[PDB]
Amino acid sequence: RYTKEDILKGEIPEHIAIIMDGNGRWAKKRSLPRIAGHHEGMKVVKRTTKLANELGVKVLTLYAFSTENWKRPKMEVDFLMKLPEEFLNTYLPELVEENVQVRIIGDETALPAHTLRAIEKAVQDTAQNDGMILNFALNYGGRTEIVSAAKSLAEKVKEGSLNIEDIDESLFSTYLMTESLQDPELLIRTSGEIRLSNFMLWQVAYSEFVFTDVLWPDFKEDHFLQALGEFQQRGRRFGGI
Amino acid sequence: RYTKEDILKGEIPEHIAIIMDGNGRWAKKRSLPRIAGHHEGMKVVKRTTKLANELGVKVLTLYAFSTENWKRPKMEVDFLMKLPEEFLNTYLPELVEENVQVRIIGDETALPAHTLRAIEKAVQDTAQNDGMILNFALNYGGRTEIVSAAKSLAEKVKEGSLNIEDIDESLFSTYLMTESLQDPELLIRTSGEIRLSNFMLWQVAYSEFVFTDVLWPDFKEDHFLQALGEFQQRGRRFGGI
Question: What Gene3D superfamilies does this protein's entry cite (chains A, B) (predicted)?
Fold first, then answer.
């Protein structure tokens, strides 16, 4: 019901985060192998990025799940681990031309060196763009990020360069992986589950959440627009805070 | 559509948390003053507690909002600050007889001494009950709880009784206000907003969320049962994790 021009009339969240769920469920629905679902979810990243950039979004964070939901065979694990390189090989020149900055958060030590080297090159090749930030959360967990922040703070306290009385909320945010990013105003979760699943626990304290049953490989422009329309409608509610 | 006997056939979450929103909106709908809405929300705490206890819930956490959403006049602030004492005066003997344990989390220094003394007496008078825990979150914030945990860990590291390499997720949970409680399996938020509002960010990493438009003073047994029915239906979904 919401057109793209309808959406552009209202407030565009500066930072949108999406939990990209449902790739496997989509493959099963389509009688396709699981790796076809993963490959397609990789392709929908490009279309979503383009639309968010065109709408003036400033940061798009995309979260991919790790292997921890359900153990998978080596063939599939290796396939997932090579997908970041295929994405960059296929789409990085367009990203460069669209003035996108590619960034990543999460445990980079979980990826193999060859893949890290390609990701780092893409980050460096786009770091002097000044347009939309495309922020991938890979092998990322909210609780371990919080613990890591606490441990780095404790190391500075141990070494004597930080006083405990100077640790407050604002300082703590600077020790998270998201330190150079404003908190997301909108979180979208596809595939029907109504859970956070250990994603940006600290940063989403005040975000609007929009849950959709649409599977991530089916999340086209019209569904993205409907999520924004819902975000916008909430800001218009009367009756007090 | 879900009866109480229907619900008792399925899984009962051991720890349910409710964000008690909509008291003010309810008063306005009913042409009643705001303090009547607060008083009524206080009364619905008793009915909800009784039902959760009867269903075998092990921990019911109830979150009340502070004054920070919108500045309020002194008369109303003072009224809210006296509500814990009225609740205990009216309902503590029943709570004792129902084998409930009363507990509280949040910044207790925000309440006046007379109110703290009554709350502490109720906690002590019910601490040798071994039934359902009724856990009130008052003047409570998820981010400040996380910061406080990090600061206590850093103090032990500073004093030399904690090594940073021993700080992990399990240890961090023991430094939160919820340390003696399992994480909630179900979070319910009334009054229609789809947000966490800085409530138990760490602890709800994997919880099911159920959002309802029902205002907290209208949240009767049948709505509580429908939320449980929805929780139960999610555990029955096919198609993989």
Answer: Decaprenyl diphosphate synthase-like (3.40.1180.10)
Of B28, B158, B196, the CB nearest to A157: B158
User: Is A158 an 8 Å CB contact of chain B?
Assistant: yes
Nearest CA in chain A to B158: A158
B105, β-bridge pairs? B137
CB contact under 8 A, A172 and B144: no
Which residue bears the tokens 């909106």? B25
CB contact under 8 A, A164 and B158: yes
Backbone angles phi, psi at B49, to 5 degrees: -60, -45
Could you give the count of Cα atoms lying within 13 Å of B81 in the half-sphere of its Cβ? 17
Q: Which two tokens mark B168? A: 């992990």
Alpha carbons B80 and B85: distance in angstroms, whole number:
10
CATH architecture of A4-236: 3-Layer(aba) Sandwich (3.40)
- Which residues does A185 contact at the CB level (< 8 Å), separation at least 6? A13, A14, A15, A16, A207, A208, A231
Contact between residue A37 and residue A218 where contact means Cβ atoms under 8 Å apart? no
Which amino acid would we find at residue A238?
A: F
Do A195 and B201 make contact, defined as CB atoms within 8 angstroms?
no
Annotation-wise, does B68 bind a ligand?
yes
Could you confirm whether B213 is annotated as catalytic?
A: no
3-state secondary structure (DSSP) of residue B181? coil
Q: Quickly count: other Cβ atoms within 10 Å of residue B63's Cβ.
A: 22
> How remote is the C-alpha of B236 from its chain's centroid?
26
B204: chain A residues, CB-CB within 8 Å: 196, 201
Instruction: Report how this structure was experimentally obtained.
Output: X-ray
Contacts of B201 (CB under 8 A, 6+ apart): A142, A201, A202, A204, A205, B142, B143, B146
Experimental resolution (Å): 1.8
Instruction: Write b or e for each residue in B153-186: b if 16 or more Cβ atoms lie within 10 A of its Cβ, otherwise e.
Output: bbeebbeeebebeebeeeebbebbbbeebebbbb
Give the domain ranges of chain A.
Answer: 4-236
Tell me whether residues B196 and A202 touch, CB distance under 8 A: no
CB A125 within 8 A of CB A145: no
**Sheet with B15-19: strands ordered across:** B101-105, B133-137, B59-63, B15-19, B186-189, B208-211
CB nearest to B240's CB, from A24, A164, A197: A24
